[PDB]
Amino acid sequence: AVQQNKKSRSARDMRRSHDALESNALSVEKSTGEVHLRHHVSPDGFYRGRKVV
């Protein structure tokens, strides 16, 4: 179906109040001091102080 009246700025912006981002699962490698996602192989290829690739 279609609408009978357009939604105003307040009504539109209220809907997208629950639309945010969060990925703060970072961790610092003990050896290389490289930032990486937790429980993930680091971009260089180290996981808990061990080269794997």
Added chain:
Amino acid sequence: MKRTFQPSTLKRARVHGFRARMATKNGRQVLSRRRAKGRKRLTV
């Protein structure tokens, strides 16, 4: 699902061609009107 326009060249020239229009009197008037309007093609 045959559409209305099935292209051809021999049929196109024998109907809408320069010699087809120039042969009859009405087609010559069409040529004169199309030239007076100043169209670039004049023959389709």
Added chain:
Amino acid sequence: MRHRKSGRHLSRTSAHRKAMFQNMAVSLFEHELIKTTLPKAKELRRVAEPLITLAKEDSVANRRLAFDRTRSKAAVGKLFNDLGKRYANRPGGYLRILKCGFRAGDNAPMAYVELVDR
């Protein structure tokens, strides 16, 4: 409903799902390291481990049974000759899964599957 049902479809039919793991194992037993998707790696550990366990007993029947499900001469040769003797005293746990970032094109959680000793 899925109550205590094991196995994930991966949006593939049964034959594609079977043939995909059959071709993932045969590739894993050539390179010993694969960059694959994490859900595909969580299911690959239920296919390669039975083959590695089967490889610990060399026999005509065992080699034929292995070939029946990982059909490749090179993989059967790699088994029963290098694998199954290296892991002759390791009870289970023949490979590990290490998550590795996300895919570039899509966002698919990737994971490295690696044999435990290499």
Added chain:
Amino acid sequence: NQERVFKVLLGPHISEKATGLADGKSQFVFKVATDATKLEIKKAVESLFSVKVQRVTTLNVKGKTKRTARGLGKRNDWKKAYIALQPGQDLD
């Protein structure tokens, strides 16, 4: 005629196929006038280069249409000829 000998050959055609033909075989590629026949272009090479040609093969090449903001512009058409010389003589 005295003319129609300095107007049938428009010059050599430099290429990779033409270069390979000149070396492997005794065929030379030329840009010829669009209204030039096979008889004119064999009596012109023998006159202006002092050689002997066994036969000539000709083809008409269409011009590439280049699109630019203003319409589609067609490049000039031209004719090409493979002047096949005798085992001796070279069309330089």
Added chain:
Amino acid sequence: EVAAKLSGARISAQKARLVADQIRGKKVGEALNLLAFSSKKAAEIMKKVLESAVANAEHNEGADVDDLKVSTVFVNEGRSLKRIMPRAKGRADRIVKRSCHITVKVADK
């Protein structure tokens, strides 16, 4: 303080707000880390803008890369390219291909 702009970016304006508000008011040390592992397309563009902004402060000024804090981030809307898309029963609808202007501003205070 120094600024950096990207006038004309393929991603639309609305999608890039959700990354801009995620880093508005943080330090550049972790602002680059949040976008280094964010999963959205806007993160790659915005990190390219942020590193250029940091390099501008480093070169044109004596500001160290440690004390900088991203102060002002706003994503405007740029030119939208209009193209048609055929649909059912002959009807054709118009499709806009939006862009945005990203302005990351860092301050050494």
Added chain:
RNA sequence: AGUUGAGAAGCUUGCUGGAGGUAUCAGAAGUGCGAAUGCUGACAUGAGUAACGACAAUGGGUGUGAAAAACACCCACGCCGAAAGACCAAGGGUUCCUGCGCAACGUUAAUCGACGCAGGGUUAGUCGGUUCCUAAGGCGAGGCUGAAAAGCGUAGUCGA
């Protein structure tokens, strides 16, 4: 922004603007838009929602590259095979091949392309046209017919 009139409205200055404006009084109007499912450009809500085009099928390794699910090669898988294979006639008109590239498209990215720039590439006594002949049919000297345009038609010459 301030201020003056019942009102239409008028007056003075901050900033921007960077070259013309017309005390007062009279004329001449294309003379004052909120609506005509009004006409033309721009921008919204729907909404970051539906869809991304058949349910042949994809999984690894190497290379390049700033960046690989889609680019190249190798291994292995699936599909068509009276076609998803080859060759002609229409039709299209360089989309064919090689270098330099991805601002745009390609329903996503792209190092790739039927995409942009620059070059190259179609060779005939024997294969198809032209040249010879004619069918349906077109035109048609003379000639009949018709207010005029023009219609019919013989000799004739065009038409695969």
Added chain:
RNA sequence: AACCCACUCCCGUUGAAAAGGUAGGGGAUGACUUGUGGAUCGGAGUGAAAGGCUAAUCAAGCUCGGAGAUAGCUGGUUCUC
């Protein structure tokens, strides 16, 4: 079976498609099907006849002029006191 046609269910209705698709269906040596060329045109043609078809338009097409037809009928008609 190719080929032609379109009897039934479902899907689709902003569709892959301005009339299609998966299943099933009728004819398939003839009143057959089809490639190329040609003839019949607007109160005029064709029609195993539905008022069907005549370039997605048909109880008489498309385009240009009479023409800014006519509308005792809708709608709209803009500054102040």
